Amino acid sequence: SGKKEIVVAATKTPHAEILKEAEPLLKEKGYTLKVKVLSDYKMYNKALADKEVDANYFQHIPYLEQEMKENTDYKLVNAGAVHLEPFGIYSKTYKSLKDLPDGATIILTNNVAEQGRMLAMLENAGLITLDSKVETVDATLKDIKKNPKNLEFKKVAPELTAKAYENKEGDAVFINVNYAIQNKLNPKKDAIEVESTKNNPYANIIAVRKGEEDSAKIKALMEVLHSKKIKDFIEKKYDGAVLPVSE
Ligand code: MET
Protein backbone atom coordinates (compact mmCIF):
# COMPACT_ATOMS: atom_id res chain seq x y z
CA SER A 1 0.00 0.00 0.00
CA GLY A 2 2.76 2.45 1.09
CA LYS A 3 5.02 0.56 -1.31
CA LYS A 4 2.36 1.51 -3.97
CA GLU A 5 2.20 5.27 -3.08
CA ILE A 6 4.32 7.76 -4.95
CA VAL A 7 5.16 10.93 -2.94
CA VAL A 8 6.36 13.76 -5.21
CA ALA A 9 7.60 17.33 -4.39
CA ALA A 10 6.55 19.67 -7.26
CA THR A 11 6.32 23.41 -7.91
CA LYS A 12 2.68 24.63 -7.85
CA THR A 13 2.20 25.19 -11.56
CA PRO A 14 2.35 23.59 -13.97
CA HIS A 15 4.05 20.68 -12.24
CA ALA A 16 1.61 19.97 -9.31
CA GLU A 17 -1.38 20.47 -11.72
CA ILE A 18 0.07 17.94 -14.24
CA LEU A 19 0.49 15.44 -11.37
CA LYS A 20 -3.10 16.02 -10.25
CA GLU A 21 -4.22 15.28 -13.82
CA ALA A 22 -2.01 12.07 -13.77
CA GLU A 23 -3.58 10.86 -10.46
CA PRO A 24 -6.55 8.85 -11.88
CA LEU A 25 -4.30 7.35 -14.55
CA LEU A 26 -1.87 6.16 -11.80
CA LYS A 27 -4.75 4.59 -9.82
CA GLU A 28 -5.59 2.67 -13.08
CA LYS A 29 -2.06 1.20 -12.77
CA GLY A 30 -2.40 0.40 -9.06
CA TYR A 31 -0.54 3.43 -7.53
CA THR A 32 -1.57 6.35 -5.29
CA LEU A 33 -0.06 9.87 -5.40
CA LYS A 34 0.82 12.45 -2.75
CA VAL A 35 2.01 15.89 -3.96
CA LYS A 36 4.02 18.35 -1.80
CA VAL A 37 4.56 21.97 -3.02
CA LEU A 38 7.63 23.71 -1.44
CA SER A 39 8.42 27.47 -1.07
CA ASP A 40 11.58 27.64 -3.22
CA TYR A 41 13.64 25.73 -5.72
CA LYS A 42 16.42 24.91 -3.23
CA MET A 43 14.01 22.85 -1.11
CA TYR A 44 13.08 20.18 -3.68
CA ASN A 45 16.39 18.24 -4.04
CA LYS A 46 16.93 18.51 -0.29
CA ALA A 47 13.53 16.84 0.39
CA LEU A 48 14.38 14.01 -2.06
CA ALA A 49 17.89 13.45 -0.66
CA ASP A 50 16.31 13.46 2.88
CA LYS A 51 13.85 10.68 1.82
CA GLU A 52 10.74 12.83 2.54
CA VAL A 53 9.59 12.21 -1.04
CA ASP A 54 10.15 9.53 -3.72
CA ALA A 55 10.61 12.00 -6.58
CA ASN A 56 10.60 15.69 -7.38
CA TYR A 57 9.26 17.42 -10.54
CA PHE A 58 10.56 21.01 -10.77
CA GLN A 59 14.02 21.28 -12.49
CA HIS A 60 16.05 20.65 -15.64
CA ILE A 61 19.29 18.61 -16.01
CA PRO A 62 21.63 21.69 -15.77
CA TYR A 63 19.93 22.67 -12.51
CA LEU A 64 20.28 19.08 -11.14
CA GLU A 65 23.98 18.96 -12.15
CA GLN A 66 24.77 22.24 -10.43
CA GLU A 67 22.93 21.08 -7.28
CA MET A 68 25.01 17.93 -7.09
CA LYS A 69 28.23 19.90 -7.72
CA GLU A 70 27.28 22.12 -4.73
CA ASN A 71 26.00 19.32 -2.41
CA THR A 72 28.09 16.11 -2.62
CA ASP A 73 25.53 14.40 -0.30
CA TYR A 74 22.88 14.50 -3.14
CA LYS A 75 23.04 11.16 -5.01
CA LEU A 76 20.20 11.90 -7.42
CA VAL A 77 19.35 10.73 -10.96
CA ASN A 78 17.17 11.93 -13.86
CA ALA A 79 14.28 9.45 -14.20
CA GLY A 80 13.19 11.16 -17.51
CA ALA A 81 12.15 14.45 -19.20
CA VAL A 82 8.40 15.46 -19.31
CA HIS A 83 8.01 19.07 -20.57
CA LEU A 84 9.80 22.27 -21.64
CA GLU A 85 9.08 25.86 -20.42
CA PRO A 86 10.59 28.39 -22.87
CA PHE A 87 12.05 31.22 -20.69
CA GLY A 88 10.55 34.72 -20.79
CA ILE A 89 11.68 38.32 -20.48
CA TYR A 90 9.10 40.82 -19.22
CA SER A 91 8.91 44.65 -18.97
CA LYS A 92 6.12 47.09 -17.95
CA THR A 93 8.11 49.94 -19.51
CA TYR A 94 9.64 48.71 -22.83
CA LYS A 95 7.99 46.81 -25.68
CA SER A 96 11.07 44.92 -26.88
CA LEU A 97 14.77 44.42 -26.11
CA LYS A 98 15.84 46.55 -29.15
CA ASP A 99 14.27 49.55 -27.35
CA LEU A 100 16.32 49.34 -24.12
CA PRO A 101 18.59 52.37 -23.63
CA ASP A 102 22.28 52.56 -22.73
CA GLY A 103 22.80 51.73 -19.06
CA ALA A 104 19.57 49.72 -18.91
CA THR A 105 19.18 47.38 -15.86
CA ILE A 106 18.48 43.68 -16.50
CA ILE A 107 17.00 41.69 -13.58
CA LEU A 108 18.47 38.20 -13.78
CA THR A 109 17.38 35.45 -11.42
CA ASN A 110 20.01 34.27 -8.93
CA ASN A 111 19.67 30.64 -10.25
CA VAL A 112 23.38 29.82 -10.79
CA ALA A 113 22.54 26.96 -13.22
CA GLU A 114 20.49 29.30 -15.45
CA GLN A 115 23.02 32.13 -15.86
CA GLY A 116 23.97 30.93 -19.38
CA ARG A 117 20.27 30.40 -20.32
CA MET A 118 19.48 34.09 -19.54
CA LEU A 119 22.58 35.52 -21.19
CA ALA A 120 21.99 33.41 -24.35
CA MET A 121 18.65 35.18 -24.85
CA LEU A 122 20.38 38.55 -24.67
CA GLU A 123 23.11 37.36 -27.09
CA ASN A 124 20.46 36.04 -29.51
CA ALA A 125 18.70 39.51 -29.24
CA GLY A 126 22.03 41.13 -30.31
CA LEU A 127 22.52 43.05 -27.02
CA ILE A 128 25.72 41.20 -25.86
CA THR A 129 28.33 38.74 -27.14
CA LEU A 130 29.55 35.79 -25.02
CA ASP A 131 33.02 34.18 -25.20
CA SER A 132 32.67 31.46 -27.90
CA LYS A 133 35.22 29.27 -25.98
CA VAL A 134 32.70 28.67 -23.25
CA GLU A 135 29.62 26.43 -23.59
CA THR A 136 26.47 28.55 -23.30
CA VAL A 137 25.09 26.30 -20.53
CA ASP A 138 28.27 27.07 -18.55
CA ALA A 139 28.37 30.84 -19.36
CA THR A 140 28.31 33.46 -16.62
CA LEU A 141 28.57 37.27 -16.44
CA LYS A 142 32.40 36.85 -16.39
CA ASP A 143 32.02 35.53 -19.98
CA ILE A 144 30.50 38.70 -21.56
CA LYS A 145 32.84 39.91 -24.34
CA LYS A 146 30.82 42.82 -25.79
CA ASN A 147 28.16 44.97 -24.10
CA PRO A 148 27.63 47.99 -26.38
CA LYS A 149 24.54 49.26 -24.49
CA ASN A 150 26.47 48.98 -21.19
CA LEU A 151 23.71 46.95 -19.60
CA GLU A 152 23.87 46.60 -15.81
CA PHE A 153 22.67 43.40 -14.08
CA LYS A 154 20.90 42.72 -10.77
CA LYS A 155 19.87 39.33 -9.33
CA VAL A 156 16.55 38.44 -7.69
CA ALA A 157 15.27 35.10 -6.39
CA PRO A 158 13.28 33.28 -9.17
CA GLU A 159 10.36 33.24 -6.71
CA LEU A 160 10.33 37.06 -6.63
CA THR A 161 11.15 38.19 -10.17
CA ALA A 162 7.35 38.52 -10.88
CA LYS A 163 7.47 41.19 -8.08
CA ALA A 164 10.59 42.94 -9.54
CA TYR A 165 8.57 43.12 -12.79
CA GLU A 166 5.44 44.59 -11.15
CA ASN A 167 7.63 47.04 -9.09
CA LYS A 168 9.48 48.20 -12.22
CA GLU A 169 12.78 47.56 -10.41
CA GLY A 170 14.63 47.13 -13.67
CA ASP A 171 14.10 47.80 -17.35
CA ALA A 172 13.62 44.09 -18.24
CA VAL A 173 13.13 41.02 -16.00
CA PHE A 174 13.63 37.23 -16.43
CA ILE A 175 10.75 35.06 -15.10
CA ASN A 176 10.65 31.22 -15.29
CA VAL A 177 7.32 30.02 -16.78
CA ASN A 178 6.29 28.21 -13.51
CA TYR A 179 6.57 31.41 -11.43
CA ALA A 180 5.15 33.52 -14.26
CA ILE A 181 2.00 31.34 -14.36
CA GLN A 182 1.94 31.17 -10.51
CA ASN A 183 1.70 35.03 -10.56
CA LYS A 184 -1.20 34.79 -13.12
CA LEU A 185 0.89 35.98 -16.07
CA ASN A 186 0.35 34.41 -19.47
CA PRO A 187 3.86 34.02 -20.91
CA LYS A 188 2.93 33.92 -24.65
CA LYS A 189 0.77 37.11 -24.41
CA ASP A 190 2.74 39.10 -21.81
CA ALA A 191 6.49 38.36 -22.28
CA ILE A 192 8.47 40.76 -24.60
CA GLU A 193 10.92 37.95 -25.60
CA VAL A 194 10.48 34.11 -25.39
CA GLU A 195 13.33 31.52 -25.60
CA SER A 196 13.67 29.46 -28.75
CA THR A 197 12.38 25.85 -28.46
CA LYS A 198 15.26 24.77 -30.83
CA ASN A 199 18.52 23.30 -29.48
CA ASN A 200 17.10 23.72 -25.94
CA PRO A 201 18.59 21.54 -23.10
CA TYR A 202 16.21 22.86 -20.37
CA ALA A 203 13.42 20.27 -20.37
CA ASN A 204 12.05 19.69 -16.88
CA ILE A 205 12.48 16.21 -15.45
CA ILE A 206 11.49 13.73 -12.83
CA ALA A 207 14.41 13.23 -10.41
CA VAL A 208 14.76 10.31 -7.97
CA ARG A 209 17.45 8.96 -5.65
CA LYS A 210 20.24 6.92 -7.31
CA GLY A 211 19.17 3.28 -7.67
CA GLU A 212 15.41 4.08 -7.89
CA GLU A 213 15.01 5.09 -11.57
CA ASP A 214 13.83 1.65 -12.81
CA SER A 215 11.55 0.94 -9.84
CA ALA A 216 7.93 -0.15 -10.64
CA LYS A 217 6.47 3.10 -9.15
CA ILE A 218 8.71 5.43 -11.10
CA LYS A 219 8.18 3.56 -14.40
CA ALA A 220 4.41 3.81 -13.78
CA LEU A 221 4.73 7.60 -13.18
CA MET A 222 6.88 8.12 -16.34
CA GLU A 223 4.33 6.08 -18.28
CA VAL A 224 1.39 8.27 -17.25
CA LEU A 225 3.38 11.54 -17.78
CA HIS A 226 4.01 10.49 -21.41
CA SER A 227 0.41 9.35 -22.06
CA LYS A 228 -1.63 11.01 -24.84
CA LYS A 229 -4.01 12.29 -22.11
CA ILE A 230 -1.22 14.10 -20.19
CA LYS A 231 0.46 15.52 -23.35
CA ASP A 232 -2.91 16.83 -24.63
CA PHE A 233 -3.68 18.28 -21.14
CA ILE A 234 -0.40 20.19 -21.09
CA GLU A 235 -0.82 21.42 -24.61
CA LYS A 236 -4.39 22.77 -24.09
CA LYS A 237 -4.19 24.17 -20.54
CA TYR A 238 -1.01 26.31 -20.76
CA ASP A 239 -1.54 27.93 -24.21
CA GLY A 240 1.89 27.05 -25.60
CA ALA A 241 3.78 28.37 -22.52
CA VAL A 242 4.48 24.72 -21.58
CA LEU A 243 5.28 22.07 -24.16
CA PRO A 244 5.37 18.24 -23.67
CA VAL A 245 8.68 16.61 -24.81
CA SER A 246 9.90 13.06 -25.27
CA GLU A 247 11.34 11.19 -22.22
C1 MET B 1 14.87 24.84 -10.80
S2 MET B 1 15.54 25.02 -12.78
C3 MET B 1 14.03 26.09 -13.48
C4 MET B 1 12.80 25.28 -13.72
C5 MET B 1 11.64 26.01 -14.42
N6 MET B 1 10.42 25.16 -14.30
C7 MET B 1 12.05 26.29 -15.90
O8 MET B 1 12.12 25.35 -16.64
O9 MET B 1 12.37 27.41 -16.39
Q: Solving technique for this entry?
A: X-ray
**CA 148/CA 171 separation, integer angstroms:** 16
Atom of ligand 1 nearest to the CA of 176: 9
> Which amino acid makes up residue 30?
G
CA distances from 98 to 76, 149, 191, 222 (A): 41, 10, 14, 41
Residues 130 and 184 in one domain: yes
CA of residue 159 relative to chain centroid, distance: 12
The secondary structure of residue 12, as a DSSP letter, is I
Report whether residue 177 contacts ligand 1, using a CB cutoff of 6 Å. Answer: yes
User: Residue 74: which domain range?
Assistant: 1-87+196-247
Distance 85 CA to ligand 1 centre (A): 7
Distance 152 CA to ligand 1 centre (A): 24
Distance 41 CA to ligand 1 centre (A): 9
C-alpha neighbours within 13 Å on the C-beta side of residue 140: 6
CA distances from 84 to 74, 95, 189 (A): 24, 25, 18
Pairing of strands 55-60, 172-175: unpaired
Report whether residue 205 contacts ligand 1, using a CB cutoff of 6 Å. Answer: no
* End-to-end C-alpha distance for the chain, whole angstroms: 27
DSSP tally for the chain: helices H, then strands E? 9, 13
**CA 85/CA 220 separation, integer angstroms:** 23
Radius of gyration of the chain measured on its C-alpha atoms: 19
Q: Which long-range contacts (CB under 8 A, 24 or more apart) does 15-18 make?
A: 15/57, 15/58, 15/178, 15/204, 17/237, 18/57, 18/82, 18/83, 18/225, 18/230, 18/233, 18/234
State which of 87, 89, 178, 206 you would mutate to test the pocket of ligand 1, scoring each by most atoms of that ligand within 8 A of its C-beta: 178
Residues 93 and 154 in one domain: yes
Residues 17 and 77 in one domain: yes
Report whether residue 45 contacts ligand 1, using a CB cutoff of 6 Å. Answer: no
For ligand 1, atom 4, the nearest C-alpha belongs to: 59
Find the angle CA(113)-CA(201)-CA(83) to the nearest 5 degrees: 105
For ligand 1, atom 2, the nearest C-alpha belongs to: 59
For ligand 1, atom 3, the nearest C-alpha belongs to: 59
**How crowded is residue 103: how many other Cβ atoms within 10 Å of its Cβ?**
10
CA of residue 35 relative to chain centroid, distance: 18
Residues 201 and 82 in one domain: yes
Residues 6 or more apart from 209 whose CB is under 8 A from it? 48, 49, 51, 75, 76, 77
Burial of residue 72 (CB within 10 Å: 0-12, 13-18, 19+) is exposed
Q: What are phi and psi of 170, to 5 degrees?
A: -140, 180
Which of 164, 180, 195 is where one domain is finished? Answer: 195
Find the angle CA(138)-CA(247)-CA(74) to the nearest 5 degrees: 55
**CA 56/CA 44 separation, integer angstroms:** 6
Distance 1 CA to ligand 1 centre (A): 32
Q: How many domains does the chain have?
A: 2
**CA 140/CA 160 separation, integer angstroms:** 21
Asked if 83 and 21 count as a contact pair (C-beta separation under 8 A), the reply is: no
CATH code for the domain of 40: 3.40.190.10
Task: Give resolution, Å, one decimal.
Answer: 2.0
Residues 69 and 93 in one domain: no
> Which amino acid makes up residue 190?
D
> Which amino acid makes up residue 214?
D
Asked if 94 and 171 count as a contact pair (C-beta separation under 8 A), the reply is: yes
Atom of ligand 1 nearest to the CA of 63: 2
Report whether residue 178 contacts ligand 1, using a CB cutoff of 6 Å. Answer: yes
Q: Which residues share a beta bridge with 10? A: 57
Residues 71 and 17 in one domain: yes
Burial of residue 237 (CB within 10 Å: 0-12, 13-18, 19+) is middle
Residues 48 and 169 in one domain: no
Residues 2 and 21 in one domain: yes
Residues 114 and 181 in one domain: yes
Residues 200 and 189 in one domain: no
Name the nearest CA neighbour of 6 among 52, 59, 48, 53: 53
Report whether residue 58 contacts ligand 1, using a CB cutoff of 6 Å. Answer: yes
Residues 119 and 104 in one domain: yes
Residues 243 and 170 in one domain: no
Distance 178 CA to ligand 1 centre (A): 7
